[PDB]
């Protein structure tokens, strides 16, 4: 239904895709404010998982 | 402004001089005599030797 292949989220996978899920690339858009989140940081590799 | 950072530098200079001098006192001999009796101690107050000159 979602149309995605959901991987294992291994510890090598989290180090590969750390800049997508643990960096400051996240931009939130609400009715209140369209904000660009800076300083967003995943502490360990379990946060990417 | 910057009253905490400028006071933390002055406190750590006080702590660095009190740490570098504690390592000077502890690695030192403190000899006291009364009547030919050499009592040798270290910086920690432990009696190293009770001698006689």
């Amino acid at each position: 239904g979602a149309g995605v292949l959901r991987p294992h989220f291994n510890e090598v996978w989290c180090q590969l895709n750390y800049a997508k899920f643990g960096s400051s690339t996240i931009t939130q858009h609400t009715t209140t404010s369209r904000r660009q989140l800076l300083f967003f940081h995943a502490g360990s590799l379990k946060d990417i998982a | 402004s910057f009253r905490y950072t400028n006071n933390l530098i002055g406190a750590l200079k006080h702590r660095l001089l009190l740490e570098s001098s504690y390592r000077e006192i502890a690695s030192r001999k403190f000899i006291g005599n009364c009547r030919g009796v050499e009592v040798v101690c270290s910086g920690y107050g432990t009696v190293l030797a009770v001698q006689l000159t």
Binding site: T32, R34, Q36, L38, F39 | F2, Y4
Partner: protein
Amino acid sequence: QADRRTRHHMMVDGQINPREWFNWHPKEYQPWYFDRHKFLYEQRQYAQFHHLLCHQVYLKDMLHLMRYPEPYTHIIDCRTSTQKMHRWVPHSLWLPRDEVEYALQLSADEFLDMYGFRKPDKSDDVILLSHNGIYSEQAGWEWKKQFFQHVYNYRGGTNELFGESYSDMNVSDVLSPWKGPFPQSGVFVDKWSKRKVLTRTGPFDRQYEMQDFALPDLELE
């Protein structure tokens, strides 16, 4: 646009009647220095509040407090419009300007309940920001109204930190050119003084000075 004529009844005196009734007298006002280039609260009309102006923290101080923060140097954002804020200044707390005169009237528990962060102590350093530094300046005046000893203002906060080009949108209330002002419609003063206040010498875009008295210069001729 298109150079609307204004509905004020100011007028230059004619070439026929004598100059009379010198207990009011308009003359041209030219000060010494230009003030339009300056900061808004460093201009001529805000000179009496010159000792009320908060001390300036600069860009390098803001970057040093971004890198190496202090526990009681409170960085506080004073921007009001939530649709115009897009990024977060680090170590900042949101206290919008239009609530500040209420916010400092609360207790510490009520401050924590109504804002989600603890009330700053009166000896703690407070640093305020805005888009241009205008809402932060009024907020610094409200913070200095209460007995807060160390209040600082970063002029041009967000527009120099994040490089934006925004403004606090201060109106600086100027009458619409259909609004006829007070001294034309009113019998508050006699007709000679009403005619002599409403006259001006030159165009009505510059500033003028009103004299309350005048004596004739008998020593010229």
